[PDB]
Amino acid sequence: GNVQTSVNTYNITGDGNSFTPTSDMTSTAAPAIDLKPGVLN
Amino acid sequence: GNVQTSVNTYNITGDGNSFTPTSDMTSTAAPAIDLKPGVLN
Amino acid sequence: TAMTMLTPDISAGSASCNWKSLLAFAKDILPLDNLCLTYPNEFYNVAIHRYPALKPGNPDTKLPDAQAHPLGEVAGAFNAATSEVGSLVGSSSTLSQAISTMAGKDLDLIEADTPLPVSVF
Amino acid sequence: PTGKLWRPVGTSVATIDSLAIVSDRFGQYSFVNEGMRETFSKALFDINMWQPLFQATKTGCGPIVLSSFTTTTSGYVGATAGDALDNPVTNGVFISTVQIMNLQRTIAARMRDVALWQKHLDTAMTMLTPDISAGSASCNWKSLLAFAKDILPLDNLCLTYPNEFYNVAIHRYPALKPGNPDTKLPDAQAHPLGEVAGAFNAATSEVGSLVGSSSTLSQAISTMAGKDLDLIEADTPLPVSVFTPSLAPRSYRPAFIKPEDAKWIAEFNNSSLIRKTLTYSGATYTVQLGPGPTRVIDMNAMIDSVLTLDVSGTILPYDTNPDLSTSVPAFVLIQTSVPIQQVTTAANITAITVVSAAGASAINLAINVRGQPRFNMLHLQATFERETITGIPYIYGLGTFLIPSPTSSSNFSNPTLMDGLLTVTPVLLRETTYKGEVVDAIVPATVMANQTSEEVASALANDAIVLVSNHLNKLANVVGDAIPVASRTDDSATSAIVSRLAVQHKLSQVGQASPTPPDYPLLWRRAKRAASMFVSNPSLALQVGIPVLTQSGMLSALTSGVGTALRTGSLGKGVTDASEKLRARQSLTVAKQAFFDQIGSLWP
Amino acid sequence: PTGKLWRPVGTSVATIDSLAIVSDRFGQYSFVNEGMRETFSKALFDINMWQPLFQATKTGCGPIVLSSFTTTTSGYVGATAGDALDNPVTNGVFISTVQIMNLQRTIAARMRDVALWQKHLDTAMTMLTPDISAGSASCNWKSLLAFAKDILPLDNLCLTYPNEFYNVAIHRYPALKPGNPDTKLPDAQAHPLGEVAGAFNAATSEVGSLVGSSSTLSQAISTMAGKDLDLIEADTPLPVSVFTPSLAPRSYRPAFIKPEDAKWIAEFNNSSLIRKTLTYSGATYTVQLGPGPTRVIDMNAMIDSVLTLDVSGTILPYDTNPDLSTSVPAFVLIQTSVPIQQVTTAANITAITVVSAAGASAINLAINVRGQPRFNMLHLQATFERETITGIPYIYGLGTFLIPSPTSSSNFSNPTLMDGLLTVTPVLLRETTYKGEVVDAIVPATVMANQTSEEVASALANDAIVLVSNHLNKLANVVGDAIPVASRTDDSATSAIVSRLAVQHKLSQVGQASPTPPDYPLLWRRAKRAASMFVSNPSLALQVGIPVLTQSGMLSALTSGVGTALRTGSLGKGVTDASEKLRARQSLTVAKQAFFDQIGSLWP
Amino acid sequence: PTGKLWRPVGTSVATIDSLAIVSDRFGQYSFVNEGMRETFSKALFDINMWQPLFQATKTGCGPIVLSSFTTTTSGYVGATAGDALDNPVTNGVFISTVQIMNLQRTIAARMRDVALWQKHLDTAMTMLTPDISAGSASCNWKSLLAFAKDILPLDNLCLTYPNEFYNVAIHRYPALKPGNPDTKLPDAQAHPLGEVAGAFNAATSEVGSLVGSSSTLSQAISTMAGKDLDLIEADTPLPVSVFTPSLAPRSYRPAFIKPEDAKWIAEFNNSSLIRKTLTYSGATYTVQLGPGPTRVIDMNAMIDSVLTLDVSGTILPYDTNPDLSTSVPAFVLIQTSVPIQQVTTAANITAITVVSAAGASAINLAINVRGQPRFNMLHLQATFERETITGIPYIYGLGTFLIPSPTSSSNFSNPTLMDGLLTVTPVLLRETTYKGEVVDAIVPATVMANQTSEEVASALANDAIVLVSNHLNKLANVVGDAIPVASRTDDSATSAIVSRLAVQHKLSQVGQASPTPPDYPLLWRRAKRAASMFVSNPSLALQVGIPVLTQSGMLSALTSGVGTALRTGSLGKGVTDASEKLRARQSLTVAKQAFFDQIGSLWP
Ligand SMILES: *C(=O)CCCCCCCCCCCCC
């Protein structure tokens, strides 16, 4: 967790972070991208 | 009690709230609204 | 079920209960199917207007208000058990109530000396 | 427009022939229609996300803009000169072949790069369930971190780049809200790059989950149109192909199946024994057809399959009648002159071929398992073929014993090894079998309430019955799945049936005193268990004597209901019992909050 | 915008009621939003492709431009006057109803046309696997052609139009690269109309196949939200409906199931025999309840099903005790006064109803299979109904024998035909059964590690256990499928569990010398086999005494991990073992190149 | 573009650093790309539809325009400053976080609202199958209505709002055509809001159903790329993970499985008996290894599983040899010095551990079922672990009896309880087993035609064979499903094989008189049953001695054919037998028209 500083806009051990799940926003990237023949073109 | 922010003018977990009954203001909404025939018109 | 679940109504002098505890407490008791757990300060804002017990902390001085301003401002003022005389809302009705009967059944004329249809009873 | 772009090779005037795919040193420019940019953008978007980890580890090469693989050509873009003429596009955005190659191998190379890191980020992320589905629940960050500082095994990648993975993470888990730099506090809202998608997956308390209930429907709709559940009780010849019978090899236990319970299996019900002989491999053996009826697999009405009669664990009493031992058990065909069930004595049996014997007598195949010597699990097995039995009116497959010398001891034995678990496997799907005949088409409606209790369980692997069972079974999972045939909600399924019972019970009341006005509360409930009994055991609808379900209306009715029922579910079908379902989710988040509370104490 | 187009109707300013669906002589113009043109273009595009075969065979009628079915009207387009008012579209592209009819029946008519040819092109194309997945591999064209000139059966359509099919083909198989006319050499690049799609399906060596790995994820995501794998170990009442129990009729073998191993089956454990009588069809028979305990199906705790006790292949010793023969085997209910397991003698048994007898005594149902006469496969069968047993505290279903005359011979026999394979089929899904009681909701978490080894395998078709098993089974295939719980990759699944074991073993160490600092290398590995043992045999998580898996945390934990795990797979999840997977694909292309080499020699 | 919108925080000059997610009091504006508006519009469109029911019941709040949740900001929109710099969008349409919240909870709240009504509309709609699939068929409206006026149960919502539901309905069922107000007659055409979608689902008589045939293909394509059917007979090491083995616990019947038919099970084939002893729980018992060979589960070659040997319904002759009774049956390991199959007498058996005994002797576990006392269904069960047997060259799991006192009576008994149904469940997927060894990778091609008839059915739960069977099984359902391997259509599957047979039979003819020119009509037909026999019983392709199917070419060939075959189906694949399929649909509509005719009379 050693301080970095600019590489990325947020420090991990940074001031006032906060792990806190909300039933409201179910974390998700993009897995189901459609590529099948008919659907991709 | 998770922070909201604007939906309503007050946060519940907000700063310096205060439960404190006073014999002076007996909490009450409006139940006895008169609607009987003669009295409503 | 959440409000009365901590008698927000006393009738002589005051009496507080440090808010943190209170909340962290009902966070328990309240059964998982209420609606005061799904909207805390969406119910709280409705509540503040019905219980002059819950005084919300003012945003720009972060302290209560002494006075409590629930929408039922007057009605709630005139129900408090005023120490001079029991309760105006009570003593008032217990009277109009009796007045109703007195005229109604026909208590007047109770020992009238003359034929009266049984219906009159 | 769509397809490759073309341009007037003959110049100016572009007719349906003065065109030509504008190819060149880069390959052919194919048009990138609006939606197809959504994909390549959605793919690149998911890679750019990992920007902070690409720089940290000096891989990558800057953010991949999809505008680096395309171009701004203009011409007519279609699939063929003729139709491309009706799509004059100006300064459209096309991607040349050689480019369609990089945007491909780039998204592929980068995809590996991230696929790896993305795996480390995960073993650490999910390693503290950042996902609840009712209300919230925090877990003081210090602890959390100081905790994973432990658990995470020394070869992750979340220990070598904490806030190089954290920055990638913040965009995938709206659970981790980074503390704002100039107020040093969270944000209430969480802004992960998947802003919308993640919003529309949360288990919304009004109705289960839109992403769920939506698919469980489109999924069912697929099947309904696909297999051909529609037309499930159609009354007219249908090619077996229409039933896509696959992976279908059912096994039995004959020598038990009554002949009338399944046409493909006749029996030698004759008074005495019918000892015959046959020179097999020099040695002369005697097929028995012993005391009992000896049910044998008939050959006609037997779709050229792969019969594999297994004889194992089954008793082998060579202990008593010594006659039994020494005889090599073997599946043998038996051509009889007079039709079986009319074949009295040996002179009647034309010939007997040992289609597959078992090397080594019955005293090496044994194995003592507490007195009663059993059969060492072995599989005899023919490969019956429709035409190898051409002309031959009577012929039967029999997995008997082949005794090397019949005696008085084997006078009440009857060596039929058919008590074993035989497994026929239709090796030629095109041809089915029904009521004893081989056909190429079924008549669905015919097979309904036409089999008996066991004229079903005794069906022959890939025969109408087994096909008109594999079919109902799909339709049975579409209702079971999508439709709510398992609650007092008088659903579309049990509703289609109720309307039939009414229209039915209503005309049966027409003519005569009509002393009974139709019920309805009783009809709704009767049809509810009818539709329910179906979802339950799809098969039943084939057995004669099943209430409601077996009248010609139903099914033909049911399906076409369930049909339109799926094509309207809405999206919020999940509103069903979305109350207890919700209350159960809050139940879990309350217990998971309890977990975070320990992570929060133990590792302060 | 979307929906039908509306336009102001009647006198007044445009308003929410001024509007009216602009219908007319052509039907109603429905708007053709951007994406919906992608489909009809993608559909027509796939037809135009077959242009060279339409002219050759004089069918068709020119290329189908989607711009022939639409129009350029303008107005407000919504689903209802109210909302259509907020979509003023000018010169949008709408397709009128009567047109939405042709673009339909045209794409349908043409679709048949091509579907046919397209089938001939194929039996010839795939008839030489034009698809490899690692590196390249040619096959000198002359040979190839001169070869198919053979194989292809005389009724194809690739022999009647070679380079009329070839031109269609070149656009579907980037394997066949036509030789350019003015340099008479190939092109290196292959330009098939499916330029992009075909590029994005190639098994990219970096990560298996984007089209694969992508779907295997969205597929799992569907299930995860669908069935309701989430909430899998929720601790609170859940309607059976929430478990979509369908096609669920499990079969057993009672008269073996211990009474305590499954509440729905009590036994008459009494000293002597309990011969009772009953006039059934005139004739008086004696139910036995012989020497042993005779386990009988209890009626209460028996969800109104369709009990069908099959009695076949099972021994039938009418040979010894002649008493047994002559008795028609039959499933019979038995109402007892005092509760069973307290019912001593005949006077205790209230009454006995033959709910389903077998016509013909025990000497026609037999069939000799080597001394030991078996039972000709037959199915007795009641149709128990919740309320037909109202009030009646004690009643049991028993598939006994009904002896026409009890004797000394049958003094140690005990005619319970329950040794047969009974098959109960819940005929009314809404109601489940648990621990012996009938309910309408389960409490998942309760059924975990609460059954015993066999208090599971002895479950009753559609009972909590069988439901809390059908559920885990889905969640078991989502992990088994999507997540890599079968390699040393400490995946998201086995990771969610590890965090529980830590937090768990960590507090059990709190208070007292704490002489053991948590392990982790040992915890990771212990939780890996825990998550693995689950994917393996989903059931286990119900049996008391299973390491890790049965602690309240796990599962509730696992799923919610596996959950978020699927919602982030990326696309290149296939990077897992995409090395040996790749090396195996090159292995195949090397062997397939070997094939083309013979096609290349034999047919020079 | 896509992602959140950014703006030059440093003003004017927007570089790859002077940007910053434009967040604020509303959250972060995320861009709403063209297609993502299609969804939220398609979702809102399906809600607006229910407008007439929202007003009727005073819920709702007016029509939901998607233009109420968005905005018209402008800036650069990407996933990260770097890539967002290449998407300058002006006055794009973004939806702020707090808005992405309402459009969410609104569509959710409204979704509940309608989901409910929409359910009532249905129990009434489908309650008269408004969907036919061939030709038309009316049902005079008066009757219809006056009819449902009955059936519909008193708690619907279609009785409280008839033409408040009717107006919602008219837009979902193009069956109900409302009578036009100013000509008081229908319309011929039906204009339901789903105008197009409903047009493209009708079972078009030319080809089954585009929506069906389309999916049944994309569905198969998913699998083909997913599981990894491609590479199905790859000849090279493949991690077991590549086979996603899940929910895989197979059960047997050892003490029957020949040792050579399955390496994981050796037998003590020794002359006399081998009575050993062992102090178990104080009491001294004698393991027997009786008269017969007593096949025992070998421990090496036994993937640390969960062996659970069930012993029930199996005979228990404590009646004869009294020696048997009193002995607690129990699964026990047996470490032998000299390798088994070479272990002659007691002094040879190193030690014997009772890994799991059954409390209570063999006379409480019994239960008389007609003379022959059986075993009360009970499950003994070890938990074998790879390394608990480290070093130990010889050790075997044996579910024997543990007699408390061997006698002359048990001199021909042999107490192996292995005749029971043992169920091994691999508890650690990563490791597989092949030919007796434990490995981490299979070599597919090796397992083809390498097992024998029963060297397959005797496979050990999660061993190469069982894995190279679970795999073919998927590929078997892709062909069975998508491809027409069940009709005389010489499909792409049976075609890929035919080309192999030719190339094969053609070179075997090279060199020598070549007196036989290849056949082809006979080859096509031989390969048709080969591809067909595969779809039928996928397994076979593992057994030595199967025509065609087991030559190295096929399969590796087949799949790669079936592969490209699915990636071209077109859409109208349903044209296959779309004639009888059509004729069957007309058959149903003729019978359903017959129904409407009664609804039309009974309720006039
Ligand atoms: C410094 O690296 C100390 C360890 C703190 C973080 C290491 C990784 C564990 C936390 C992950 C944060 C990013 C997403 C999980």
Ligand SMILES: *C(=O)CCCCCCCCCCCCC
């Ligand atoms: C967050 O919701 C934590 C729980 C705190 C409040 C929940 C409801 C109990 C207190 C009620 C406040 C409004 C009027 C009772």
